[PDB]
């Protein structure tokens, strides 16, 4: 048939080792451009004036970093939220100095990752699956949008986005606690519950299915060879796992429906991580965590410190040291 | 940078030694 149709049928083929798809067509070039720029900047890029103050930060291996201190550094505060493609610079040399790779990497990446999400929908359509895997992935995608896009928007600068590096990430976490008391935000307490509970329920389901594997092997061989791919039957006894777990606690604290059990596993972390992504996204507009500073006082009116006053003393130490040359005026309002 | 120069040999055998163990076990599996 016609060439446009051969092509469409290739793009959407469910025979390709890796699925392309129409989301695939945008995802592929953009993730490649982010990956190649990132790898090259991490090894070789020269220092970057993150805070706009002519004090460059060295992020790359060749300029004296290791795997753990290395980063692609966010773009200059002098740029704020202006678009800064390579073609807006007088020279690559100017682009490197002012943080250009960071913009290239995060934009191509947010985009390619958003299409990753759609591609999961797409393949599930072509396979005849239910479609909501992509909804579970929206929780980590949301989170990336928050630290790379939303938080810089509320604050006026991509320079306050999360760096692309191990130590840069910690830098970002400490500055955020000082400026937003994120630990005292419920949405983050929800995210911790999301991930602690996620890991807990992961170990539980893992340990409970594994606890009730049907003897189909001997002691000289992996019990894994008791499962044959695409076997009609189940390999553990869910009735037996229920009878164990219902006794560990009580009968109705235990799941006896498999579908209800797995939906629980999907929803618990996904929800909580939606909340903590919403957490970073709303503290992007300085709606901060609870403030109980000097909240208890005695008959006279002396302050009686609580543990929240001890948190605020730490916060304050982060406050006054961070970006130590970059404030001229008493309040750090962005 | 003034790094530990026994770090190279330490990283090197850290990789090679357990890596070698696994290759040995995989090949003699494929040949029976």
């Amino acid at each position: 048939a016609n060439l446009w149709e051969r092509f469409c049928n290739w793009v959407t083929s469910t025979d390709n080792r890796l699925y392309v798809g129409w989301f695939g067509v945008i995802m592929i070039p953009t993730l490649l451009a982010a990956t190649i720029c990132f790898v090259i900047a991490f090894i070789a890029a020269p220092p970057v004036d993150i805070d706009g103050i002519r004090e460059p930060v060295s992020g790359s291996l060749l300029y004296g970093n290791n795997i753990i201190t290395g980063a692609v550094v966010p773009s200059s505060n002098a740029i704020g939220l202006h678009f800064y493609p390579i073609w807006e610079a007088a020279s690559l040399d100017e682009w490197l100095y002012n943080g250009g790779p960071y913009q290239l990497i995060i934009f191509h990446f947010l985009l390619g990752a958003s299409c990753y999400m759609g591609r999961q929908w797409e393949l599930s359509y072509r396979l005849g699956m239910r479609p909501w895997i992509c909804v579970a992935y929206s929780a980590p995608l949301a989170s990336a949008f928050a630290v790379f896009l939303i938080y810089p928007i509320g604050q006026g600068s991509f320079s306050d986005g999360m760096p692309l590096g191990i130590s840069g990430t910690f830098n970002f976490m400490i500055v955020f606690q000082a400026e937003h008391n994120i630990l005292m935000h419920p949405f983050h307490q929800l995210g911790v519950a999301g991930v602690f509970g996620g890991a807990l329920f992961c170990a539980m389901h893992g340990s409970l299915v594994t606890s009730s594997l049907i003897r189909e092997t001997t002691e000289t061989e992996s019990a894994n060879y008791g499962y044959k791919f695409g076997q009609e039957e189940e390999t553990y006894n869910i009735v037996a796992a229920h009878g164990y777990f219902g006794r560990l606690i009580f009968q109705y604290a235990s799941f006896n429906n498999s579908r209800s059990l797995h939906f629980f596993l999907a929803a618990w972390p996904v929800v909580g991580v939606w909340f903590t992504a919403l957490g970073i996204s709303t503290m992007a507009f300085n709606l901060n965590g609870f403030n109980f500073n000097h909240s208890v006082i005695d008959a006279k009116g002396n302050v009686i410190n609580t543990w929240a006053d001890i948190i605020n003393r730490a916060n304050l130490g982060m406050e006054v040291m961070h970006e130590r040359n970059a404030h001229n005026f008493p309040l750090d309002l962005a | 940078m003034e790094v530990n120069q026994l770090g190279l040999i330490a990283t090197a055998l850290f990789v090679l030694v357990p890596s070698v163990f696994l290759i040995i076990l995989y090949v003699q599996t494929e040949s029976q």
């Binding site: 080792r17 795997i67 791919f229 076997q231 | 940078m1 790094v3 990283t11 990789v15």
Partner: peptide, 30 residues
């Protein structure tokens, strides 16, 4: 020598990725 070691190890990981995907034990249905 430290920069080299890091890039070498990262390069082996990416090579691993390629054989893990394209040269896997292919799954089969019995």
């Amino acid at each position: 020598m430290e920069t080299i070691t890091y890039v070498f190890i990262f390069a082996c990981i990416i090579a691993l990725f390629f054989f893990a995907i394209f040269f896997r034990e292919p799954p089969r249905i019995t």
